[PDB]
Scaffold this active site. Structure first.
Site, PDB file in Angstrom:
ATOM      1  CG  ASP A  96     -48.749 -40.269  25.190  1.00  0.00           C
ATOM      2  OD1 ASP A  96     -48.445 -41.483  25.214  1.00  0.00           O
ATOM      3  OD2 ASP A  96     -48.180 -39.464  25.943  1.00  0.00           O
ATOM      4  CB  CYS A  99     -49.352 -46.307  25.650  1.00  0.00           C
ATOM      5  SG  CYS A  99     -49.537 -46.769  23.892  1.00  0.00           S
ATOM      6  CG  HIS A 227     -53.917 -48.560  24.605  1.00  0.00           C
ATOM      7  ND1 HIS A 227     -53.141 -47.444  24.837  1.00  0.00           N
ATOM      8  CD2 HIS A 227     -54.688 -48.716  25.707  1.00  0.00           C
ATOM      9  CE1 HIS A 227     -53.434 -46.946  26.026  1.00  0.00           C
ATOM     10  NE2 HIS A 227     -54.374 -47.695  26.571  1.00  0.00           N
TER      11      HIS A 227
END
Ligand SMILES: [Cl-]
Ligand SMILES: [Cl-]
Ligand SMILES: [Cl-]
Lengths: 328, 327
Positions: A96, A99, A227
């Protein structure tokens, strides 16, 4: 019938864990950085799944493990390349924009940062405090790039990025300097394993503290495609060494992981700093010539010490054990 | 907030369930197997008037079967007495094991997802002598050609965990055996056509035990559209009292709930029998034939006694509070 995600295993215990974290933050009067009194010393490990049967493992792995990122980092030889050390596993993490914090929180506490406690602490430091030494270290690192495509505003925005304000995802993404600030809030090194090791891969040391006041086992994260995920140790995996290597094989030699944001005098003594802030061990690994062995540095990883009372993974495990018996 | 009650502490749900089969006592002299201690537990639901409507809505979509609640209230079958505490219907999985899921949730806040209750019913039916249950059932059946042995065999078969809905639906005799396995009365409030224009509804007593050996507060379930739910008492201050009426309104008169599977002498002393197995009180209600009030019988309901350690509703509540303070 299992929990689709970890947090679903004991939603009540999760709330309690999260609620403890703000209270453990100490906030100095005199400009020394706010930091955790105790909880930074926790480490989660993942439980073994091999004693289970295939359709069951799938359930578990689908539920808990980021298999895409594990496969990516493993195929590029950055993750679990060394036969001598214990396997690390990537846990799913919400992507989101928060992370970095979700993965770091999960590594220590088995919960994500959904109440924004880590995120707010970072922003807090970079707005409520002055941060002179941080900006300097960031300039120094930025200017190391052999080229500059034609930066007065860049620092101010970096502070803005750490805010909980909506940008795109729910939160602004974070960068290298935020990782370094974060490791000084935790008084604990963070090591990030990624492909380029935008250059987030490498080693972040809490240099605003003497090593004597820090936890000497790292937090380990994996990074790919914007990520972050935690890379936690798989449990009872001896006889392999509980450690993460501080080099990678690259084109037939060993190359040191980058150490971020060092001053010139710190850089001149990089090995000495690594040995103060981590527990460095010198271990033998196979060479490219099958007739040669090489010694490399690795940093010890912590043992699982997160108590049951605050461990979603142990509850997940008992859920699993109760369910397996029904399947047998 | 979790979308169902059990998602609030999956680990605790398992602990609770793992305690249940160990609490069953299996006799060797032919006496039915039964619970030693856990049959005495009772769950109460928490209030949600302290929250704002949008929040109330989420709690209610998560926990409450509002379809059945609305159906039973609109017939004046549920929550029709002004003097008495409100009961609320909790969602229950509709998989053919819902009789057990609803009964299990009423006592323990978990459903019967390990099939402990279902297996205990089938075990009694298959592996003991059931002569008295059969006799009582024959009498109720008679109050076309019948084959008793063929039909009894079928009712035992329905109790199994055999897929036929994941499981066979259960009917009155199964509730009767179940209340004798729990040593605790079960009162069912069901949907029912207006007399002016069903049979599962009524009172099931553990008559294979002396009353003094049974727990004297009932388990209360709702039944509609072939589905069972527990009807749990709402927590509250005074002054209203915890009870469930033992009669229904019927236009200008009252109609006693059916008491199931009685022998004829028992049926002759039914009021006496009800006072042995339940705590029967009298409550005045507004009359519909002329007359300000009439006394009707009601059974007292238990106070919440499910310790936190085994209460998913406490954990759910604490989550509601945390999630609320944030807004
Ligand atoms: Cl190797
Ligand atoms: Cl190579
Ligand atoms: Cl070599």
């Amino acid at each position: 019938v299992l929990p689709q995600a970890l947090y679903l295993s004991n939603m009540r215990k999760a709330v309690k864990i999260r609620e403890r974290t703000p209270e453990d933050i100490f906030k100095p009067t005199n400009g020394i950085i706010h930091h955790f009194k105790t909880m930074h010393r926790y480490t989660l490990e993942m439980f073994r799944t091999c004693q289970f049967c295939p359709q069951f493992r799938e359930i578990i792995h689908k539920a808990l493990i980021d298999r895409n990122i594990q496969a990516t980092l493993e195929s590029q030889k950055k993750l679990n390349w060394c036969r001598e050390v214990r396997k690390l596993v990537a846990l799913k993490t919400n992507g989101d924009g928060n992370c970095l914090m979700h993965a770091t929180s999960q590594y220590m506490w088995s919960v994500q940062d959904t109440d924004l406690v880590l995120r707010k602490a970072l922003f807090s430091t970079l707005k409520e405090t002055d941060t002179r030494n941080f900006k300097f270290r960031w300039q120094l690192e930025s200017l190391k790039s052999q080229e500059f495509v034609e930066w007065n505003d860049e620092w101010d925005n970096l502070i803005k990025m750490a805010s909980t304000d909506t940008p795109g995802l729910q939160y602004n993404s974070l960068e290298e300097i935020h990782i370094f600030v974060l490791c000084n809030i935790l008084r604990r090194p963070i090591i990030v394993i990624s492909d380029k090791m935008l250059k987030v891969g490498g080693i972040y040391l809490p240099l605003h503290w003497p090593a004597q006041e820090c936890y000497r086992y790292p937090i380990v994260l994996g990074y790919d495609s914007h990520h972050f995920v935690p890379l936690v140790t798989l449990k009872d995996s001896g006889p392999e060494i509980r450690a993460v290597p501080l080099v990678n094989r690259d084109r037939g030699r060993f190359e040191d992981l980058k150490v971020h944001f060092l001053t010139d005098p710190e850089n001149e003594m990089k090995e000495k700093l690594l040995k103060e802030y981590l527990m460095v061990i010198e271990i033998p690994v196979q060479g490219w010539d099958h007739g040669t062995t090489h010694l490399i540095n690795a940093a010890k990883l912590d043992e699982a010490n997160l108590p049951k009372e605050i461990n979603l993974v142990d509850d997940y495990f008992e859920l699993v054990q109760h369910e397996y018996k029904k399947w047998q």
